[PDB]
Short mmCIF file of N, CA and C in Angstrom, two decimals:
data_model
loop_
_atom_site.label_atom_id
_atom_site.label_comp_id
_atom_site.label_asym_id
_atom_site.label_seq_id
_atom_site.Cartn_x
_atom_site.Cartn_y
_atom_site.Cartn_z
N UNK A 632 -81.87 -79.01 -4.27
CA UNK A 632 -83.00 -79.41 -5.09
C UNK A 632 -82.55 -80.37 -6.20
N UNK A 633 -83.37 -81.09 -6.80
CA UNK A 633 -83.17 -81.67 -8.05
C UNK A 633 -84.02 -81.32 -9.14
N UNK A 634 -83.51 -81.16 -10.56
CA UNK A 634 -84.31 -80.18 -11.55
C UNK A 634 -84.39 -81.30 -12.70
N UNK A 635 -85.11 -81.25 -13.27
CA UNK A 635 -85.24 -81.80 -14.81
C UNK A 635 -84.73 -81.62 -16.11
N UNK A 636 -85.31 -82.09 -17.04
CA UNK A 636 -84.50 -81.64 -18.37
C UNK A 636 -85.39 -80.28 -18.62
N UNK A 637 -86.42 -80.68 -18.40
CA UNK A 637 -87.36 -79.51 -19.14
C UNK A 637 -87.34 -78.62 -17.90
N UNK A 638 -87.16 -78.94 -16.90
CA UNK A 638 -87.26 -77.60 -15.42
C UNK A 638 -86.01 -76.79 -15.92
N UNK A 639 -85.20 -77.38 -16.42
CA UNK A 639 -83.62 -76.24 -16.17
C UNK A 639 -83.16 -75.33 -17.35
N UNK A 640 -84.61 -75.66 -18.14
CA UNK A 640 -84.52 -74.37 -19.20
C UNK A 640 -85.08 -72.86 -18.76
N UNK A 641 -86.08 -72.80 -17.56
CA UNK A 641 -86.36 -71.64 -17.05
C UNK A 641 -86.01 -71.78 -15.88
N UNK A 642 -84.35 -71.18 -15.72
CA UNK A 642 -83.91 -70.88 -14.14
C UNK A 642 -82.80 -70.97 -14.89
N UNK A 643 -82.06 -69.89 -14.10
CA UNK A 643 -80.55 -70.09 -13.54
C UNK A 643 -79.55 -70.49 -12.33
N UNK A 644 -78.68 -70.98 -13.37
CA UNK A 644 -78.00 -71.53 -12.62
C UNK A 644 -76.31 -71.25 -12.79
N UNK A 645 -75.63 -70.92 -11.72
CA UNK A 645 -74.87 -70.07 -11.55
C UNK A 645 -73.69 -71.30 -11.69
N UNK A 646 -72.20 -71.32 -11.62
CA UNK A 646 -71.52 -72.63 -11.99
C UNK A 646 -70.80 -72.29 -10.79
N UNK A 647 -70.34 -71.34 -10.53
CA UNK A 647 -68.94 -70.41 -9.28
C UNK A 647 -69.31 -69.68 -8.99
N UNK A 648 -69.29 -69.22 -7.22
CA UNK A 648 -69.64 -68.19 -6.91
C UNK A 648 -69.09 -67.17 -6.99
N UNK A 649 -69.63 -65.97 -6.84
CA UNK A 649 -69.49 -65.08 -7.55
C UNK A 649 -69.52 -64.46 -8.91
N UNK A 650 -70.83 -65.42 -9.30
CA UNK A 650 -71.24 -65.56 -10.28
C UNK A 650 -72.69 -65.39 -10.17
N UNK A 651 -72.90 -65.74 -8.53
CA UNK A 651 -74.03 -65.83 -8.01
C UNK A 651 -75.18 -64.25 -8.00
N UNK A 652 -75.80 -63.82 -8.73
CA UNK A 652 -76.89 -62.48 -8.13
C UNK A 652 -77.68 -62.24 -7.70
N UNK A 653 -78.05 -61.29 -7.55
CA UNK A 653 -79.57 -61.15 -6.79
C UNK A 653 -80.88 -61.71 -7.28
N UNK A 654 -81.46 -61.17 -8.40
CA UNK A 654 -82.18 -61.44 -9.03
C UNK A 654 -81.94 -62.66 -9.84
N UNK A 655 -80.99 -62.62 -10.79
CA UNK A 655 -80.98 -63.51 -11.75
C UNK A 655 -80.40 -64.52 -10.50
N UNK A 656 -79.86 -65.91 -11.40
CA UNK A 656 -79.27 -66.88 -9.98
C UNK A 656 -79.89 -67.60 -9.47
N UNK A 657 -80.96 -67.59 -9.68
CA UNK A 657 -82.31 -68.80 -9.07
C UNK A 657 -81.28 -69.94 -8.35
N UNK A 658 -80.44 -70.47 -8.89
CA UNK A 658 -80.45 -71.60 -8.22
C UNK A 658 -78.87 -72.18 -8.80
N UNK A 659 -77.92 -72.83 -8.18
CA UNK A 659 -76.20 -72.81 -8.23
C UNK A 659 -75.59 -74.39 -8.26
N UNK A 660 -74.85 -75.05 -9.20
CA UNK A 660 -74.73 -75.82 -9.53
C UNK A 660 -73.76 -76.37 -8.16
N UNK A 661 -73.87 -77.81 -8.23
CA UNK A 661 -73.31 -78.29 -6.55
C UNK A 661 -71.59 -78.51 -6.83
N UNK A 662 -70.79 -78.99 -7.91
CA UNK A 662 -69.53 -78.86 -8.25
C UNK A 662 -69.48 -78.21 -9.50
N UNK A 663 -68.48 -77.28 -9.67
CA UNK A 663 -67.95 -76.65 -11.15
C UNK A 663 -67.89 -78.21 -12.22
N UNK A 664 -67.33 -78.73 -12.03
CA UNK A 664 -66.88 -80.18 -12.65
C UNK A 664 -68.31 -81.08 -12.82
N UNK A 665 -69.53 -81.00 -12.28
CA UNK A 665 -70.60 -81.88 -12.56
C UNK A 665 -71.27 -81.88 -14.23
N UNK A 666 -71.05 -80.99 -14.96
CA UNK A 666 -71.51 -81.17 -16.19
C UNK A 666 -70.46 -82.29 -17.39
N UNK A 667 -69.68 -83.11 -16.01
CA UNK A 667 -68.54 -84.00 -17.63
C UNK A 667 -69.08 -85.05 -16.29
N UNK A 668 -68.61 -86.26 -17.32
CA UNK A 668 -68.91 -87.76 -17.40
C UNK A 668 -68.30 -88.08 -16.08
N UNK A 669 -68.58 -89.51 -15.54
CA UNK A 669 -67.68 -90.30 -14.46
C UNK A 669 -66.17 -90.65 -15.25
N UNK A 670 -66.05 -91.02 -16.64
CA UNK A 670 -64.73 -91.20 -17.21
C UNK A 670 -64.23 -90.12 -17.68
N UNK A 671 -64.91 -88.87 -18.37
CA UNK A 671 -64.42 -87.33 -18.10
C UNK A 671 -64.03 -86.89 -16.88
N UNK A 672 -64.24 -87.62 -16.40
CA UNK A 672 -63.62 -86.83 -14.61
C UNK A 672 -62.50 -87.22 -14.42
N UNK A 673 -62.25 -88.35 -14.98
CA UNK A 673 -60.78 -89.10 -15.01
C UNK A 673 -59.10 -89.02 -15.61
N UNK A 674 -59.88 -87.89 -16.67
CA UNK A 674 -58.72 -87.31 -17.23
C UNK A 674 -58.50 -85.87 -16.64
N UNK A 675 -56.68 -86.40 -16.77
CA UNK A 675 -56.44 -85.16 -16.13
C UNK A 675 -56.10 -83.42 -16.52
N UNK A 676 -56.20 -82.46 -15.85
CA UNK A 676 -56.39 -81.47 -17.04
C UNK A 676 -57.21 -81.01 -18.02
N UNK A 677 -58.20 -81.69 -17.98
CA UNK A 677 -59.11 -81.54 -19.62
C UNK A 677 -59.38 -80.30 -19.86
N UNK A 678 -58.87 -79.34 -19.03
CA UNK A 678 -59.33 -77.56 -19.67
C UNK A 678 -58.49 -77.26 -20.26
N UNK A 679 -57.06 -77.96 -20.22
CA UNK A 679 -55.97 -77.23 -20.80
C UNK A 679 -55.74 -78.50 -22.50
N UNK A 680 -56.21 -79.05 -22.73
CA UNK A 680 -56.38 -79.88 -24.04
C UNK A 680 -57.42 -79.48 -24.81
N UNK A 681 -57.14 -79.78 -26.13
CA UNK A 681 -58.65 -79.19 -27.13
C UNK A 681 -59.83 -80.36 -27.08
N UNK A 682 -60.88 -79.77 -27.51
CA UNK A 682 -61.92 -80.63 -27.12
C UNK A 682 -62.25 -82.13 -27.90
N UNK A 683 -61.57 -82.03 -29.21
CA UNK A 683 -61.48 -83.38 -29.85
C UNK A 683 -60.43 -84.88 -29.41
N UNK A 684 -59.52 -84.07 -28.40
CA UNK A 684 -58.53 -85.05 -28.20
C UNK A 684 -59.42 -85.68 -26.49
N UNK A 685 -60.11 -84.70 -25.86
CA UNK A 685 -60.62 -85.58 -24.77
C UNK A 685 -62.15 -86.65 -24.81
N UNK A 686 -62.51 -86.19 -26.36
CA UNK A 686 -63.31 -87.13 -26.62
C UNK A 686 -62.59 -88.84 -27.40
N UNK A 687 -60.97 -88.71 -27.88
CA UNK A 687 -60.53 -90.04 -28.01
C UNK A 687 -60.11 -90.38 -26.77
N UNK A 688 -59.62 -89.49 -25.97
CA UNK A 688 -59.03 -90.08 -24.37
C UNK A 688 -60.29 -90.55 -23.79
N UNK A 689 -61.64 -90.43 -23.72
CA UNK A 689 -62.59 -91.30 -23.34
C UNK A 689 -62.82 -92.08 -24.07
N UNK A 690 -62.27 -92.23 -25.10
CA UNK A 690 -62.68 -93.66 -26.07
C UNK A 690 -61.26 -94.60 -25.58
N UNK A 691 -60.37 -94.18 -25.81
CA UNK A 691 -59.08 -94.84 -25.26
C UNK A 691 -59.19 -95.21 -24.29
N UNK A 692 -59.45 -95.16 -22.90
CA UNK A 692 -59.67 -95.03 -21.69
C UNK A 692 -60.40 -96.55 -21.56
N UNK A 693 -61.31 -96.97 -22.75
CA UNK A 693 -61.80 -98.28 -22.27
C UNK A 693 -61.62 -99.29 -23.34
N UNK A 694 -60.06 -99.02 -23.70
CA UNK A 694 -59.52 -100.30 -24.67
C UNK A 694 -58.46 -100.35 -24.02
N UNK B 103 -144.70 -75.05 -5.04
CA UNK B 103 -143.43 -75.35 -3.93
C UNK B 103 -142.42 -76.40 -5.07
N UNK B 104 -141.49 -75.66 -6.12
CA UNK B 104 -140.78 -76.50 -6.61
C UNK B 104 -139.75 -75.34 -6.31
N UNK B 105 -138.61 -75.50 -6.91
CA UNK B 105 -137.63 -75.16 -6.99
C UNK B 105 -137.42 -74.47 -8.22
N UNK B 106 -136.95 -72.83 -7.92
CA UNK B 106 -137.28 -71.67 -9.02
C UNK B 106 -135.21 -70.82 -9.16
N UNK B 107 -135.26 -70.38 -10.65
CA UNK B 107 -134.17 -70.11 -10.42
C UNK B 107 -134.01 -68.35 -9.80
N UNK B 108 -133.05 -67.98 -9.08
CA UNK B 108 -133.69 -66.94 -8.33
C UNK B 108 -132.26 -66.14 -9.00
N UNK B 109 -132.21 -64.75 -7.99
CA UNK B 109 -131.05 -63.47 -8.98
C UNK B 109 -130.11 -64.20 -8.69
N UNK B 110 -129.64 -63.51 -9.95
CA UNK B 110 -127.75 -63.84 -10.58
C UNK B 110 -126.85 -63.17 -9.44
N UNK B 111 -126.12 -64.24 -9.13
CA UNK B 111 -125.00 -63.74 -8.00
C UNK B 111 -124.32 -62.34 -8.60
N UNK B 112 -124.21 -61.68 -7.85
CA UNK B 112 -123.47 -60.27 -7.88
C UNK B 112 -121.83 -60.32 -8.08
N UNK B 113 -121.99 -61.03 -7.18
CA UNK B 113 -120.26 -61.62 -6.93
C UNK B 113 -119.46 -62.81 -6.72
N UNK B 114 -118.24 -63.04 -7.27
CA UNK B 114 -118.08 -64.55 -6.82
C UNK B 114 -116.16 -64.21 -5.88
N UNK B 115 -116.36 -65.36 -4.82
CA UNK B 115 -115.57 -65.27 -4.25
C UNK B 115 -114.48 -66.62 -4.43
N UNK B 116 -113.13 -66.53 -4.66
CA UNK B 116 -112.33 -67.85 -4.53
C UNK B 116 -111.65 -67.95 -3.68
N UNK B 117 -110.99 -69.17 -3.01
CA UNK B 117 -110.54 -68.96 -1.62
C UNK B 117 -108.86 -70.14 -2.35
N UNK B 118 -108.39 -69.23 -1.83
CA UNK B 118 -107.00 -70.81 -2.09
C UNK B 118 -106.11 -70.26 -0.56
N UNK B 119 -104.98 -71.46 -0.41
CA UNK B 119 -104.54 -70.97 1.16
C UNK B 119 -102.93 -70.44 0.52
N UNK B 120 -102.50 -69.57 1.11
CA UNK B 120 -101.14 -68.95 0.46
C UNK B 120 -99.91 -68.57 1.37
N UNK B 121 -98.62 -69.46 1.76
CA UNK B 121 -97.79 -68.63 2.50
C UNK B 121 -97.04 -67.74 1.78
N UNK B 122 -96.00 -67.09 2.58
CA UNK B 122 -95.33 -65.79 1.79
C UNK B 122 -93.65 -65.82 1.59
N UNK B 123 -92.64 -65.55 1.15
CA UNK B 123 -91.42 -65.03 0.66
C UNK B 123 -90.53 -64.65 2.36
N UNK B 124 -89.69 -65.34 2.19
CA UNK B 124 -88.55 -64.90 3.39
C UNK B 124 -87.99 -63.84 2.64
N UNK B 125 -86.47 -63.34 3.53
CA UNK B 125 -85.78 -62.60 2.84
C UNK B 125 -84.72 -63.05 2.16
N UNK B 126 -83.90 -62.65 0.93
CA UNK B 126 -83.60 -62.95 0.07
C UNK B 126 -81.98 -63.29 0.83
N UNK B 127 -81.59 -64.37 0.84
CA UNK B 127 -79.87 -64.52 1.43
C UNK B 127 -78.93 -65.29 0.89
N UNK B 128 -79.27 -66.18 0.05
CA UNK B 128 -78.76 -66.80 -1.09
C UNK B 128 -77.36 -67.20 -0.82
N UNK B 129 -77.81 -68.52 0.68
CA UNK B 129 -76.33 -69.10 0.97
C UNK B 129 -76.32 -70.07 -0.04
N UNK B 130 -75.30 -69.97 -1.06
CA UNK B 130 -74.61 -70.75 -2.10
C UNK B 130 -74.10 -72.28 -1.02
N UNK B 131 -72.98 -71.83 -0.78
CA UNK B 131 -72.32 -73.15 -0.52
C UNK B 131 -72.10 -73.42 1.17
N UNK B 132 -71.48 -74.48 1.31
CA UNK B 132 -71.09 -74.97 2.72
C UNK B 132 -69.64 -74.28 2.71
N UNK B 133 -68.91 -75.01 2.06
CA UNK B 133 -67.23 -74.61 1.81
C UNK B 133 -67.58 -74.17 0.51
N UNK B 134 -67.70 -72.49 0.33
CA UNK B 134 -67.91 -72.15 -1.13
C UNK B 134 -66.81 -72.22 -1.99
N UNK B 135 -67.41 -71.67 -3.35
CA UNK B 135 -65.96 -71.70 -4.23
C UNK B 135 -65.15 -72.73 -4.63
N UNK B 136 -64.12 -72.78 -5.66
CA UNK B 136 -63.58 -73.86 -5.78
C UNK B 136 -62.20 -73.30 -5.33
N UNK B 137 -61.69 -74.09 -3.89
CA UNK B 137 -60.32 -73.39 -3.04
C UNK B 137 -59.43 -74.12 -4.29
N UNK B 138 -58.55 -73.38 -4.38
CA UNK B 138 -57.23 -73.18 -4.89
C UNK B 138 -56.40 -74.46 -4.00
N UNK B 139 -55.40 -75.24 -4.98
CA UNK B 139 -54.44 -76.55 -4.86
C UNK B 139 -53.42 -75.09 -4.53
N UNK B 140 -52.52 -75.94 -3.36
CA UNK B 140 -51.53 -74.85 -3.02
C UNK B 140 -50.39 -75.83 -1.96
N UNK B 141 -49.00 -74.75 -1.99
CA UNK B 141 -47.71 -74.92 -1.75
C UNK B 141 -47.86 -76.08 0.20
N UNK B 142 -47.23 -76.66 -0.07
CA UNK B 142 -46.91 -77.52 1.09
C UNK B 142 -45.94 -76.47 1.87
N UNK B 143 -46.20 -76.09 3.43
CA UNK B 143 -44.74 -75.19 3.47
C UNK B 143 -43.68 -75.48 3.74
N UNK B 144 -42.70 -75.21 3.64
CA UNK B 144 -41.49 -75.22 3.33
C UNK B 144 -40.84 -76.32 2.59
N UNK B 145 -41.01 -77.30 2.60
CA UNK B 145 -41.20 -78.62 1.51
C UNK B 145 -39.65 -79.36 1.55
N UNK B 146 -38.68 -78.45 0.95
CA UNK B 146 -37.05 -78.62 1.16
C UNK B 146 -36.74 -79.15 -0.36
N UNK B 147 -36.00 -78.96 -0.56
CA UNK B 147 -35.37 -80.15 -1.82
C UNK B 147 -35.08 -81.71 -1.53
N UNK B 148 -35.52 -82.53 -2.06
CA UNK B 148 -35.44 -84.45 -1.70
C UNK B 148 -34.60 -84.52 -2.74
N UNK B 149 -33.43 -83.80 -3.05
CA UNK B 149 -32.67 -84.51 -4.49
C UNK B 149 -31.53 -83.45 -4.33
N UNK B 150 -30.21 -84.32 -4.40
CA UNK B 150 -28.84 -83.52 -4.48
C UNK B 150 -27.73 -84.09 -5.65
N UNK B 151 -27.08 -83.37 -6.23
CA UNK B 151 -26.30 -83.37 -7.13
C UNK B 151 -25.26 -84.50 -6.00
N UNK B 152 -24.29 -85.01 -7.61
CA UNK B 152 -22.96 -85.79 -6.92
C UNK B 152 -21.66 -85.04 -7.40
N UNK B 153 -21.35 -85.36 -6.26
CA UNK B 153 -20.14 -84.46 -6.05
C UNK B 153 -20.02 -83.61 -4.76
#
């Protein structure tokens, strides 16, 4: 499916399965990784860095 | 012979058309999960000391 800004405030959505339930779970995100950028995708590691240094590595990234 | 208003309907009926709910099976993924990066087997060492 495809959801909206305002559709994806009532529903869930699960990130990994097994995360997935019965009831709750409406509906399961298509990659773990889809909520960061096309140039967030590019750096490597970004779970294991703090979150201020991968917002200059996307600024760096296009100088 | 005109046209008179006659008794108040008793009842009113609405009609809408409705299908129904499968059963609940909630296939997530094709290749679920996110598989695990893993060991090449046996691999060998590509690098030797001198001497």
């Amino acid at each position: 499916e495809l959801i909206g800004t305002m559709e994806q405030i009532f529903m869930n959505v699960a990130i990994f399965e097994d995360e997935v339930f019965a009831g709750v779970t409406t509906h399961q995100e298509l990659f773990p990784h889809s909520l960061l950028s096309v140039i967030a995708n590019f750096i490597p590691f970004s779970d294991h860095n703090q979150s201020p240094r991968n917002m200059y590595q996307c600024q760096m990234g296009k100088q | 012979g005109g046209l008179t208003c006659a008794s108040a309907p008793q009842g009113t009926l609405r009609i809408l058309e409705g299908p129904q709910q499968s059963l609940s099976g909630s296939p997530l993924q094709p290749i679920p999960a996110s598989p695990p990066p893993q060991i090449p087997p046996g691999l060998r060492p590509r690098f030797c000391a001198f001497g």
